[PDB]
Design a protein around this ligand. Sequence first.
Ligand code: QYP
Length: 133
Amino acid sequence: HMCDAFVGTWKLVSSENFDDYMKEVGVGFATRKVAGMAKPNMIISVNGDVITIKSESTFKNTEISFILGQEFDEVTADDRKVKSTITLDGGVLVHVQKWDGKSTTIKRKREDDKLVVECVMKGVTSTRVYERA
Ligand SMILES: CCCCCC[C@]1(C(=O)O)CC(=O)Nc2ccc(Br)cc21
């Protein structure tokens, strides 16, 4: 029941500062423009200890499955090959991605009826708000 409040189908309703976050990550111009237009559906499910997060949009369909605290390989939507570790910290899912000596952290939190996604690279944050579909 670790992630009960995250489970479901969620749709993007707002984004702030995403272009600058993507610049900080190293995403090129064309990908930033097309990715920034996307309105993804995030589908979160749990089966035993395995959490699955799918992101479906006109830009890309991605899927990760993982066990908390256990590192995995991820190809991100912008095609980075990263090493990821996701943990639960005080009810927040904390997702760290490492690649090429760089790091970014994505936090996912339930706040009221929203799922808030905070993406941080160096001092640049983007906040993306999802609501139930
Ligand atoms: C472009 C790389 C950074 C995306 C960071 C934001 C995120 C989201 O909104 O959930 C993270 C994620 O897990 N999948 C995903 C998929 C598509 C797009 Br566009 C955006 C996302």
